[PDB]
């Protein structure tokens, strides 16, 4: 693994906010964790994953 400190980006697409924020992480997991805490606080998390369509992360409200 590569224990490097990198910065990543996150976009939210809910019925609350439709903007973007960013965070710092070590690996994929770290990023996911900080972003989740934030998204929880906000009140979103239906489709909560990663985006490979402009190196971003995404929390959309499209549940099944």
Curated annotation (Swiss-Prot):
Subcellular location: Secreted, Cell wall
Domain of life: Bacteria
Sequence repeat windows: 7-61
Name this polypeptide is given: Immunoglobulin G-binding protein G
Organism whose genome encodes this protein: Streptococcus sp. group G
Lineage, opening ranks: Bacteria, Bacillati, Bacillota, Bacilli, Lactobacillales
């Amino acid at each position: 693994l590569t224990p490097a400190v990198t910065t990543y980006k996150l976009v939210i697409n809910g019925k609350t906010l439709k903007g973007e924020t960013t965070t710092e992480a070590v690996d994929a997991a770290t990023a996911e964790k900080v972003f989740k805490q934030y998204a929880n606080d906000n009140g979103v998390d239906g489709e909560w994953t990663y985006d490979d369509a402009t190196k971003t992360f995404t929390v959309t409200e499209k549940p099944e």
